[PDB]
Amino acid sequence: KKHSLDLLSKERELNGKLRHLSP
Amino acid sequence: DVFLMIRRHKTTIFTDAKESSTVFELKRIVEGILKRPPDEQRLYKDDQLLDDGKTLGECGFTSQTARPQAPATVGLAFRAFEALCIEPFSSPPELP
Amino acid sequence: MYVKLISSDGHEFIVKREHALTSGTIKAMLSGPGQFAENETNEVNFREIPSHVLSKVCMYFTYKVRYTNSSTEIPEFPIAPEIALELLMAANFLDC
Amino acid sequence: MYVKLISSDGHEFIVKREHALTSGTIKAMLSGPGQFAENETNEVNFREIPSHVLSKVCMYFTYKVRYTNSSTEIPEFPIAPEIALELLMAANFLDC
Amino acid sequence: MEGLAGYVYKAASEGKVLTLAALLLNRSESDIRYLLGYVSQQGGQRSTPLIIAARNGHAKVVRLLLEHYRVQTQQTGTVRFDGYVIDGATALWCAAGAGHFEVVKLLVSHGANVNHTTVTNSTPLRAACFDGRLDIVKYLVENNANISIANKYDNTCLMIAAYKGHTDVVRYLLEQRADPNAKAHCGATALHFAAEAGHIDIVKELIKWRAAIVVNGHGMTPLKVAAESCKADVVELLLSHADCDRRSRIEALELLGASFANDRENYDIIKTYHYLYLAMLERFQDGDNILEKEVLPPIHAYGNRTECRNPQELESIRQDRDALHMEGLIVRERILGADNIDVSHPIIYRGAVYADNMEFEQCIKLWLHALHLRQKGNRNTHKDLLRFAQVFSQMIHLNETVKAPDIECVLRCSVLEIEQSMNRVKNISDADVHNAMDNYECNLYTFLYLVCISTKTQCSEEDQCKINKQIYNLIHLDPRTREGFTLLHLAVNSNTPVDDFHTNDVCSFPNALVTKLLLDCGAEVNAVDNEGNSALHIIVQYNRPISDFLTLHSIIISLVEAGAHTDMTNKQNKTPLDKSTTGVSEILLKTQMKMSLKCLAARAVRANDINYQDQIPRTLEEFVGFH
Amino acid sequence: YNLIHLDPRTREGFTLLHLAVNSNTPVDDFHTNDVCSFPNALVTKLLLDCGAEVNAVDNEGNSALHIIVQYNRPISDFLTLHSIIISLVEAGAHTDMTNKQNKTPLDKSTTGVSEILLKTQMKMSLKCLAARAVRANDINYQDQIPRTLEEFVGFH
Known part of the structure; x- marks a missing residue:
């Protein structure tokens, strides 16, 4: 593992998107 | 807290593990050391083959x-x- | 991540890196033009100390790493009467 | 070098110098313009500490200077229920 | 009875038809309604046997339950999906979300409410279109299903199908009088969601079906996110739409090249240069109607360029990867502004790939600039601060000099974020309080890592002094862990976690230097957590008292040099000697005490239950409270 | 350093280091008793920096460590005792060397404070364990080991 591999894109907005996407 | 001594014909590996640990963990570190597949390696506690599933706490490897x-x-x-x-x-x- | 110790009879004595580095001359041989920055064998060949004494040296490595900061009811390290006067020479060669 | 502790009741409580220098503020009183290096009286006046509390304070001075280096289950300092909560202000005003 | 309800629920979940007809046989009229509808809290979800048979797809069990026992279809329950929690949904919703046609048909024929909504106004049609099963959505629409009504979040089936890879359901939706102009909270219409997914056929068909390109509430256009998500097939069709604007055309395939320049998923240079060159030629052909760029003044951290105004510098950076990437980042920030949170990710990725091959300075300045940009936006920068402490730990392990102002600014940002977390968790709800506190704990741990980094650096007098005032402010706002562990308690604890990065090779706990620095900046040394422990009670429990002895030794004397009371009793009335669990710590603390007649008098007062209120000095009250 | 190289000894075998670490060293009671307080950390540190031999022995075999571990004031004067032990160990001393009565410095340590200070300074070595085994089993080590190891077993 390195810095790029553990770099995870901002998912709070993705979490912010999916609460609006609750079917 | 169990310390044991894997023995080949000549090779001798020194091993640390847990009392509540199974054969799988030590077989995996022997994987990481001797680089041989685990099906063709088997242990011998006092010249008695042991199954690959039981923990070493009751197998006989008390601290x-x-x-x-x-x-x-x-x-x-x-x-x-x-x-x-x-x-x-x-x-x-x-x-x- | 392991260090392969070879005795005078050819007995491989693969032990942990940090366990072997508790002795001065093992650290010295693993330093200098002996680093082996690949961590698969890191072999160290001893043409002097027999197998029965290097076995106890590796046992002592594990014993001191386990009990490095206990200071309470330190258990005795079993030195056989015959293996003394010769484990002493090995421990003098391998500083600490 | 034999200082005299005087309580609020006029009770002189003459105690040794090193015994009474354990308390910080008695050292402060004997320091400064309170030295009079003539080894005559070394008088310190406690307008507030009662005699039944200054007595326990002097006994504490002796007990501390005796048992300061034991660390082998020193006997408990006997503090009466009534002396406590009045010995506390004395031990605060006379630091340590 | 309650016992048989659990067995009925288990049989419905397993769907053993040989067990339903045996467990539900010979049941009274009241019991057959009490059992069917019982609240069973399993795995954190409230699962009615009917809804758990509908979700598992047991068509035979559902048919037997509905036809024979006549269970109502209005029963509600909670089903735990993959990151989705929905409560109040009916069995039809559960069957549609799990995508099983037979249960949906049986429930509808038995009278399930197709128009029934959950707490967030969510219809089973959305559940059916979530996994994009054409048969189920066709059957539901043919059974009086409304598509104009969205959920509580203004999110209908159209955009749910737009995100998902299924195209049959979205085509069926658009073929049954669907309105694609529905707007979310931030003005987001169906084209925004379709372009964010970037599905070629969905966005191609949406053009023919009144795409209606409009600007949402962010001053942000669907073409901007179409070209921002690194997809070079949607912008051409968005241009093929008859209402494309020239300025939108200018931003398109230029911001697209900018995103292609700096992105982990779509990192390439030839593609980026090709789209940049064609976007430049889109305006550089008229001459008399030229559209000169409006470029902001250059940022010192952003090199020293002012973008490209001539083709010569465009073709000069053809073989320069770093220059082209940096121009792409600059133009991306110009078009997207300084408010979008997503502009930091390309900077972070560029810094990471610059650091992965043992060079640090450009990575350091890029991550510092990204930290500044996210500080302007007021975001939870806890993970970025963690990785930033990680890169300091790495570069210290590789023995390269550390910029003291970088530590200065990251510590002031850390204390500001800690204060933000305090006011947030003060006004937080009980739903996310646990994750808010976890984020706060991560901020505390990364603050300690940064403090350890600062102690590992040879900062000058002014730098270290202002770090001291900032830490002074941090303790003066009193940050406390959920277990009462103040900053000192975490600094003197070996149980403080350290992440798997290079931090464990540099930042380890307990630390003598970190403890001394905390004691320097006015830390409450005698702070007491919920268990009653203090810094001394924690440091005496150190499990490595010889190999790290000096550090342990130093910490103890530091506490004794800062007024830590060695006689303090915790909630179980254990002095730190009673909590030593070690000879070394025991004797160190014994040698670091004084006889302290104050302690004996306070112990006598505490043991005799004397009312010490207002009859001793104000400090002596808390002194007695210590013992 | 000149005096240390002269290597003085008292009647009972005390070198300069043993006197500098002994609390029983007679200090003059006129004015030196108010300043010169033995044992003193600074004089021992200065002697060790001046090349003082550390493993010297008395007529009773006690080294500087055997003398310091018997200190009667380990609490009220902890800094001096700790500094003496640190200096003696760092300058090179055997934490388990035996005197004529075969007492290691841990055995001679009357106060437990010095016991655990030395234990924190003590480092486990296989050479010491093997020498202890050789001495305990009384196996003949004459000419069987290097010349240094002969004396090493001699004082273990």
């Missing part, structure tokens, strides 16, 4: 018999099954 001062010798063999051919160490010289 009061596999202390790091004198780790419990554990045999091993690889597929060329193959008998236990653990070569003993050199005989110490007598007292002068």
